[PDB]
Design a protein around this ligand. Structure first.
Ligand code: GLU
Ligand code: GLU
Ligand code: GLU
Ligand code: FES
Ligand code: FES
Ligand code: FES
Ligand code: FE2
Ligand code: FE2
Ligand code: FE2
Lengths: 437, 437, 437
């Protein structure tokens, strides 16, 4: 469970040519909402796995993802003209299709073959249920299908999405969602029956079961009746977490914790009902805030302004390191265990720590980190095999391996959740929970 | 035409002791307007070729250029008292003349010889037609006269000047003014006869002729009548560009692209009539803006506020990297090929690229860069000889070599512009264009 | 007197494991006002000698000083809950006493021994006359008593305190207070009898006498009557300066110039009467400003806002590098030798120089720096012995060695101030000056 500086480096470094950056590049990356690029409209800057890029939707409705720098003499592609089914650099007129193929160089002789030989760096994009996905691996023609992540396979009326930039490395943010025991402590109310059933037993015991695409982490608690309440969080490779539903207005939430660069993470959150249209009231509260506080989702109107040249320029929060997440001491005294003004914010402020990259060689884990330690083991084993022998993880070529659900089961004391919950943990089209969360 | 990382380094690095910084130091540097330092008034911070300095005009009207740091115990010289024909550090009273010679140390015994031995680093300044020039080379007593650049030799009523800081390395900005084919593309209007004659032929062919002080770059276009329209841009060592005049209210513009440091450039722009007082209307539009947009010059009231301790503290634009040059997508859609709100801004946003120093080893040149490639050849050859054998460029000791003009000639198809334009490309006191631009 | 780059490095570097950082760690560090942490109230971030920490006062009134980072999984301790005589990280509930001992880990089994073995990095704090002191040395059980610095031993009604962050390395700020000749120059009025008696003789001669805890620096001036006026500034190890009193409303001022990190200094200033309650008018002017200008103390309401996560978040001035200390040229012309709007500000702007760490290998000292040079000699000798042989300075284990006062004596021409001022330079409980300042 104890990590060297070297192990820490293998996990946090995601830039081009790095171990973890190479392994991340074997998977499709969910990187933007469909709505963010309008056909023939403004391009949108992103940065993914350390690389600065520009997405645009052409007039025929197709999205390309290209270098942010023009390959001619280096002008910014975000200032290009998106029209006639291409993005054209305004400096000398080089025009690129969504594929990256250059289509015109107006300043060059018309006989010139330079144009047909020219490509801007570009990555294939797929689009599903309002989400754009990119494949950044070296062999696009050998890319598998999108992963069978249920949240992105249900009709859109069943799902609610948000995204935000968090100012820390991806893995310490991901860990925060495989950490069942934190929630009652960090997110609880001062003083006072209980508020969640997790509040009933503050020290779950842990059991973890590896499968082809990650690990199931069962947090086993005692119930005031001497049954077991098992919350099973799911990790799916390389950067997915699934959160076990609560009692009221039960839904399946989770994130892809997409590394923007070594210091920043795109926190793509989803909340879905597996079988019914999503709760209308919940949807609105995600978007507008709840009792004046952020939910687990980022609300729609609480982002700062950034220029178009910044990556994810519309996803930087008004709650950030530079203002200590608008921490409110008085509310910590009077009402909330933590004075951060919302659910995701409480998570972000803790997990982002006092520097953007956690040094795990300095940490001191307890039993509450059992699941965290086990998930790291999966990552490290995978990345090391990739470095040692060039072997890819099974899950990088197996879309059907992602058909998982987190579950919150009530079972006899000492029960085997892996058997009792076998069916409920299986994702299926339009199948309901199969139990009472 | 293909540059190594190493060649790129030789060109972009301008700090003390570097190859290009050594070669730049062989030439007089135009570095401030006369009006910027009033006799006995406030000193003004500058940084040139990587060095932080303070200019001041003493009570007798003479300008000195000295270290920004007091040589005693390091106090900032910009806070010194400019009076009694010296600048005096307020910490312990050391007073320096424009030459750098220390004149008084009030806290020292009056017998002490330390004072007469003490000099602050200082560089010789010359003043001509409202422009201050500095010589930063190691052997001031062997400095040639100022270069015979016509723009700075005409009476002031014939010339209009602006300066601005651009947040990129000097050479990529200079290149933008030896790049005839860019202009119709970057600076054109959406949709629609034509607007400039350059718009008639979007792919000039290129011919370049080296001379003692740089290179003449002839962009040859076709005319709708089967004559040739040749625009000859001029590069003069080490950092001058001359722009061929347009048809209406023809004038000769250009820049010295003065390296402030490796990441910043002082863009000193001049526009002159060679024989008549400058167009009054043009002058005002440079100063005030044109249809609410910047011209090629920076307007007088569109700079941000900076503290006196910053170099060129009054020349940082309100249009800058941090706000994406106030890019306006709607105007790009409706009216302008590029949505940057002015001529210089369109140039700056493209040429400054996505990082302050362009890596030319990553670029992909075409025929439109013929002149750019040829100018780099001149620079690289010069800097390499200087490194290899210590040989100075001819033009570093030949003021009369700078007597050039850019020209825009109409000539028979296939004509020899070098002969037909021989006289028009020669600068002479009060001589008119000698043709119709 | 001439320092190598290497000597400069030995003096300016104060982080963990460095020479000067090791030697500083042998002494108690005055680091906060008592009033800054209320019992059971908000914790307060500090950084000392390169280390980021959190101070808190528990419900029983005791102060702890702990790592700013939770030793579990790295959450910020400044967001912890200060209650029930501990500070508890909100992420997983780890609770720490003022000693650093962990008291609870709610998420762990109740049998678990991890808790009793766990400590957060913590340092012992002592409290005296409204000042909190920390011991950061490796052997706390062998720490001497607090130093017998009189300013912190008188009843509080005799003393006035301020603190501010200055954006430069500690030693160049400390030097400014062992530099008698600066004051009449930097702090004087334009044109015009005199204003201080230091203004009568602008070039004192210097004599220095080392003692166990530092050096006495006598600046000897001529009086308009042919007597001697000796101002004796005191340096006490490692970072104390004592300022000789003036004529009117004489008081003893000084600072501990506490290194926050290599680039920042906590300027803890004290002004006391040795025998009477402090002048009420003086006290108010320190707090409110004097004729609209800062005194030597920072006024109470001229700090910028910083988030709770910044060290010394309430001590960053509105007069700072980023705004050139609100320098006012017009006032420099009309009224003040230096246009900085106050006494400490004039000091700060000069001594902070043009970069945060002065490179002494580039300086050019004169006789006015005699005391500065001698104080450096004491520091360098001490730090070198510590590195060479592991020997600690005498003064690091001798509280009674700090019982010193600066003095401003009137004595016969050529007198021996060390004998004439022997008694006046001795600090004693409630003893008056023993002369007329
Ligand atoms: N995102 C949820 C996860 C809840 C859980 O792990 O049970 C939180 O931060 O509380
Ligand atoms: N400064 C002018 C140069 C014009 C030319 O090269 O012809 C521009 O940016 O358009
Ligand atoms: N802090 C005082 C010290 C005065 C002295 O050294 O005499 C000043 O800056 O002027
Ligand atoms: S820089 Fe993009 S076309 Fe020339
Ligand atoms: S620092 Fe300039 S005179 Fe002393
Ligand atoms: S990070 Fe502080 S208790 Fe877990
Ligand atoms: Fe949480
Ligand atoms: Fe241009
Ligand atoms: Fe002073």
């Amino acid at each position: 469970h104890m990590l060297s500086r070297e192990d820490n480096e293998l996990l946090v470094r995601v830039g081009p040519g790095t171990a973890m950056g190479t392994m991340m590049r074997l998977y499709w990356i969910p990187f933007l909402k469909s709505s963010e690029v309008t056909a023939g409209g403004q391009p949108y800057r992103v940065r993914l796995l350390g690389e600065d890029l520009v997405a645009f939707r052409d007039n025929s409705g197709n999205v390309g993802l290209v270098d942010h720098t023009c390959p001619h003499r280096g002008a910014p592609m975000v200032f290009g003209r998106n029209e006639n089914d291409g993005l054209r650099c305004v400096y000398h007129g080089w025009k690129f299709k969504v594929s990256g193929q250059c289509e015109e160089m107006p300043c060059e002789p018309a006989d010139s073959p330079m144009c047909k030989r020219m490509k801007i760096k570009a990555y294939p994009v797929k689009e599903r249920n309002g989400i754009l996905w990119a494949y950044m691996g070296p062999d696009a023609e050998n890319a598998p299908e999108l992963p069978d992540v249920e949240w992105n396979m249900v009709p859109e009326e069943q799902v609610a999405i948000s995204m935000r930039v968090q100012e820390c490395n991806w893995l310490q943010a991901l860990e925060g969602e495989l950490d069942s025991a934190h929630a009652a402590i960090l997110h609880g109310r001062v003083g006072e029956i209980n508020q969640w059933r997790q509040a009933q037993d503050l020290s779950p015991t842990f059991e973890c079961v590896q499968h082809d695409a990650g690990i199931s982490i069962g947090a086993r608690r005692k119930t005031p009746d001497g049954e077991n309440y098992v919350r099973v969080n799911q990790f799916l490779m390389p950067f997915w977490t699934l959160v076990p539903p609560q009692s009221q207005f039960p839904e399946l939430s989770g994130h892809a914790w997409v590394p923007i660069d070594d210091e920043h993470t795109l926190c793509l959150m989803f909340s879905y009902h597996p079988a019914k249209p999503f709760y209308e009231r919940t949807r609105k509260l995600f978007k507008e805030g709840h009792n004046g506080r952020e939910t687990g989702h980022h609300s729609d109107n609480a982002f700062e302004k950034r220029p178009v040249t910044e990556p994810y320029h519309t996803y930087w929060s008004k709650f950030n390191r530079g203002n200590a997440y608008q921490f409110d001491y008085q509310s910590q005294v009077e009402k909330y265990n933590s004075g951060m003004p919302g659910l995701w914010i409480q998570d972000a402020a803790c997990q982002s720590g006092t520097t953007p990259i956690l040094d795990r060689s300095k940490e001191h884990l307890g039993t509450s980190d059992t699941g965290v330690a086990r998930m790291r083991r999966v990552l490290l084993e995978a990345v090391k095999k990739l470095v040692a022998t060039g072997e890819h993880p099974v899950s990088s070529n197996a879309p059907a391996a992602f058909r998982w659900r987190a579950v919150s089961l009530t079972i006899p004391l000492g029960g085997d959740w892996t058997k009792l919950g076998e069916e409920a943990m299986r994702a299926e089209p339009g199948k309901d929970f199969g139990y009472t969360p």
